[PDB]
Amino acid sequence: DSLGREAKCYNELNGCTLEYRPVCGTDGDTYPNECVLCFENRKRQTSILIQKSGPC
Amino acid sequence: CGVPAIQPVLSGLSRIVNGEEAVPGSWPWQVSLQDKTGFHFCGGSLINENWVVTAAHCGVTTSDVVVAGEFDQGSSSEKIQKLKIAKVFKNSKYNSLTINNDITLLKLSTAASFSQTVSAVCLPSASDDFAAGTTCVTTGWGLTRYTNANTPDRLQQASLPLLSNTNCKKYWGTKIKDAMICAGASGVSSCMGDSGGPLVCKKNGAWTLVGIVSWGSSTCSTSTPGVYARVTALVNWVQQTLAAN
């Protein structure tokens, strides 16, 4: 109904980069980085977007 | 190089579920990369009184700050150094798809003032060989549990052994390149916020920079090896950028 911005993985790698760059998902949750939000959507077969960067 | 005035105390807790808290000041080369907002997003190690070495995926800007001498980030105040950055040297061969050649050099505007709590790490020789199965140290403010989503205030340190390319490929398979070195898979993991920090292997009394925190398990799996930028494979570039700058 709303939204903004899709979280990107490194597809050419199946683990993430270890930087701390929290993202606020459209779900109300904080993700340590974007790659995390992506792997979580993959596993969960979910489609959570990034609400705002930084923490919720 | 590579001798903390202040001596680390590595206990058996350093080897299990995401290490322990460091003796304050015991890893002097440990710095924190921060925003204008004072928010920690990567680590780094001081190789000079002028340069910091880090991972290239970190996206360090000239707008970002290097904080030397911190223990407790939640300190209303301690004696630290907020050094500015003047020039960023991102490896030309860094591959963004692959995270291969994941080193970046930060040249400081403001020299760091080596103290008892601020010093530098020894860089290795290209021909240097750090045997698989050697127990090393990794330091940072990376999460302690993926499930925390709150980076710790205090520097942590984990003890993990080195791995052969060969036995890491069993877990990462083809992703493992030559400018990469694996470590852990032993009860301890590098995690969000540890990126660009050090993987120190003591050599002939000195603590030496063998890896840079790069990437690994999307969930900070203690039974999976963590990947680091392999310093021996990128040190001539460090040497040559330093010389021309």
Do B132 and B46 share a structural domain?
no
B195/A contact by beta carbon, under 8 A: yes
Q: What is the SS3 assignment for chain B? A: CCCCCCCCCCCHHHHCCCCEECCCCCCCCEEEEECCCCCEEEEEEECCCCEEEECHHHCCCCCCEEEECCCECCCCCCCCEEEEEEEEEECCCCECCCCECCCEEEEECCCCCCCCCCCCCECCCCCCCCCCCCEEEEEECCCCCCCCCCCCCECEEEEEEEECHHHHCCCCHHHCCCCEEEEECCCCCCCCCCCCCEEEEEECCEEEEEEEEEEECCCCCCCCEEEEEEHHHCHHHHHHHHHCC
CATH classification at residue A51: 3.30.60.30
CATH classification at residue B60: 2.40.10.10
**Which residue range is the domain that position B241 belongs to?**
28-120+233-245
Integer angstrom CA distances of residue B205 from B1, B8, B12, B122: 10, 13, 21, 10
Tell me if B142 and A12 make a contact (CB, 8 A cut-off): no
Do B141 and B34 share a structural domain?
no
- The 3-state DSSP class for residue A46 equals coil
Q: What is the residue type of B4? A: P
B102 is catalytic: yes
Dihedral angle at the C-alpha atoms of B40, B27, B198, B155, nearest 10 degrees? Answer: -40
Resolution (A): 2.3
- β-strand partners of B34: B40, B65
Tokens standing for residue B174: 């083809």
Question: Which of the residues B32, B45, B189, B195 is marked catalytic?
Answer: B195
Integer angstrom CA distances of residue B187 from A50, B58, B143, B150, B158: 32, 25, 15, 20, 9
Q: What is the SS3 assignment for B193-222? A: CCCCCEEEEEECCEEEEEEEEEEECCCCCC
CB B118 within 8 A of CB B125: no
- The verdict on residue B4 lying in a domain is no
Integer angstrom CA distances of residue B104 from B59, B73, B76, B122, B237: 9, 24, 31, 17, 10
Contacts of B3 (CB under 8 A, 6+ apart): B119, B205, B206, B207
- The verdict on residue B1 lying in a domain is no
Tokens standing for residue B10: 């590595």
**Which residue range is the domain that position A55 belongs to?**
1-56
- The verdict on residue B75 lying in a domain is yes
What residue has token string 């898979």?
B185
CB B126 within 8 A of CB B231: no
Contacts of B25 (CB under 8 A, 6+ apart): B4, B5, B6, B69, B71, B116, B117
Do B134 and B38 share a structural domain?
no
CB B137 within 8 A of CB B207: yes
Do B227 and B152 share a structural domain?
yes
Q: What is the CA radius of gyration of chain A?
A: 10
Do B217 and B199 share a structural domain?
yes
Tell me if A21 and B41 make a contact (CB, 8 A cut-off): yes
Instruction: Tell me how the structure was determined.
Output: X-ray
Integer angstrom CA distances of residue B196 from A41, A50, B148: 26, 25, 20
Closest by Cβ to B57, choosing from A19, A22, A54: A19
Angle, CA of A21, B22 and B64, to the nearest 5° = 35
Tell me if B218 and A16 make a contact (CB, 8 A cut-off): yes
Question: Which of the residues B45, B102, B189, B214 is marked catalytic?
Answer: B102
Do B73 and B20 share a structural domain?
no
* Count of domains observed in chain B: 2
* Count of domains observed in chain A: 1
- The 3-state DSSP class for residue A36 equals helix
Tell me if A20 and B142 make a contact (CB, 8 A cut-off): yes
- The verdict on residue B3 lying in a domain is no
CA pair distance B121, B110, nearest whole angstrom = 19
Do B21 and B52 share a structural domain?
no
Do B217 and B131 share a structural domain?
yes
Do B107 and B60 share a structural domain?
yes
CB B33 within 8 A of CB B61: no
Distance, in angstroms, between A37 CA and closest chain B CA? Answer: 10
User: What distance separates the 2 farthest-apart alpha carbons in chain A?
Assistant: 32
- The verdict on residue B5 lying in a domain is no
Do B214 and B167 share a structural domain?
yes
- The verdict on residue B54 lying in a domain is yes
- The verdict on residue B11 lying in a domain is no
Do B131 and B21 share a structural domain?
yes
CA pair distance B136, B108, nearest whole angstrom = 28
